[PDB]
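Illustration: green-fluorescent protein.
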Amino acid sequence: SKGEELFTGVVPILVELDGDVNGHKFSVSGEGEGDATYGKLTLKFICTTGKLPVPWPTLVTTLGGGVQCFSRYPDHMKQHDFFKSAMPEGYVQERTISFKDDGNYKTRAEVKFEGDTLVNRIELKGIDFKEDGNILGHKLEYNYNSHNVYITADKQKNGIKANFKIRHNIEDGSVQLADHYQQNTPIGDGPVLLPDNHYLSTQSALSKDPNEKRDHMVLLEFVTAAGITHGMDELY
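Result:
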């Protein structure tokens, strides 16, 4: 597509989140870069309102997985890249994140280019969370498990749909399931690529900046598209 040409090199990213989880109002500001050629995302997020009322791992898919336009789509699979095709005008990404035996997050994000910078403006609404559950009781470990984002086309809305499961490690050795339902629709009226069924192999690594005193999260994320058959092995 025409949109993929904007991702051939290193692109600066800005992430801004406005959230409310059970009446707890918070804001997150993120800065970094993405290099789609390697499916690499390098981002540092800071809670500008003080202490984050939810665990940092619960926000990774909204903060880092909000810019899936940085996924590495192998050459044989490039006609299936919806994300980049909607650029520069961008896309609206909506999610319903359901935490098993707890509450849910409803997110709406507008992802587009503001000059040569890729921006992700998010509004997060969290409801029905237990006072001392795994989320509000901060019982989730500061780590992450690799997952696959299963994508399907939504021809009616000229976009895509995605379904995936996030497994958050709890401090006692248990697992907190976070079911994700995703919908993406283009902002512009230009032609986009409607993909066949495939997935994004996503690997997230969380760390801390030793020189940072504010509540933060340093994220290194690798996203690679796969799941579509090719005849490349016959060439060898």
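Reading the tokens back as a structure: The two ends are 29 Å apart (CA to CA).
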